[PDB]
Amino acid sequence: GWASETAALSETATPQIDRITIPLHELAAMPKASQRLLDDSAFDIETW
Amino acid sequence: ALNSAVAAE
Amino acid sequence: ALNSAVAAEGGYLVDPQTSETIRGVLRSTASLRQIASVVNVEATSFDVLVDKTDMGSGWASETAALSETATPQIDRITIPLHELAAMPKASQRLLDDSAFDIETWLANRIADKFARAEAAAFISGDGVDKPTGFLTKTKVANGAWAWGSLGYVATGAAGDFAAVNASDAVVDLVYALGAEYRANASFVMNSKTAGAVRKMKDADGRFLWAEPARLMGYPVLIAEDMPDIAANAYAIAFGDFGNGYTIAERPDLRVLRDPFSAKPHVLFYASKRVGGDVSDFAAIKLLKFAA
Asked: Which residues of chain B make contact with C94, given a CB cutoff of 8 A?
């Protein structure tokens, strides 16, 4: 508030804070590749 | 004295 | 830029000049401090050591075999040294915008009010929390005078001076006070007992008493705290207050500004501490109006 030349001047306010939690999940993919296919093909499927 | 609002004080 | 009389046509340019120092009403400063014994003391109390009796002398003969003689007994009177506090509340917006030095103005005014308020304690103050004045000191009629009391002489009629002869109670009040105490002794009255004394006159209409306004060659302290002429009042006192009344004090005016409790204000707390009662019971006589 402003002020009154004759006032109690009470405690006004204070920011009530909030905590936001970033949960930090994991992102995972597991593709299955055949041990035949990974060996006999000409293409580098392991890096593809 | 007291406050500056009311003149007589 | 026309005339200064009307405000609109150039009357706002004239900005009236304020005073140099903020004045005040000038109340009575006659406070018994200039007639009593002020002692600086940094303690809780003050103990005067008086002698309530005297020794003995011999006039020893040529062949006398002189024996013992008296040696006086000694009274300790304790000055309690109470404190006197005042705390006005002043606004910070005033103190920042109020070009007069408001802090030292309140200091002057608090010192004035303390010098005025300790006078009533010096004169008619009681025991608790303030100096015990000389009026509240268990008066015992003169002639039957012992050490633990103040003497008085009585005027006669109940609410006035004596009808047949006046100015006699005053003069045997003077000559019932002791020879050495009258070297520097003073009357203490107030401003409307002094008026009633000056209004007394002889049978012809001429007032019979002849800037300190002394009475019969003795100075007069115009107090404002002794009672006026009542039925059993003690309106006029007289004596050697420089030996009779001991004021004990600290000669400083302790000021603490308090910006925290009253938060938009400043709240100067100023307090000196001062005490005192009678020290020599023979040095003050009183005027009772009883009989």
From this structure: 1-4
* C196 Cα distance to chain centroid: 20
- On chain B, the residues whose CB falls within 8 A of the CB of A4 are 5
> Rounded CA gap, C25 and C31, in Å?
17
Closest CA relative to residue C257, chosen from C102, C39, C134, C58: C102
What are the counts of helices (DSSP H) followed by strands (DSSP E) for chain A?
A: 1, 0
Q: Which residues lie closer than 8 Å to C120 by C-beta, 6 or more apart?
A: C133, C225
Q: Please tell me what resolution, in angstroms, this structure has.
A: 4.5
Considering only CA atoms, give the Rg of chain C.
26
Please name the helix (run of DSSP H) or strand (run of DSSP E) that holds residue C186, with its range, or none.
Answer: strand C186-190
CA distance C90 to chain B (A): 5
Burial of C50 (0-12, 13-18, 19+ CB in 10 A): middle
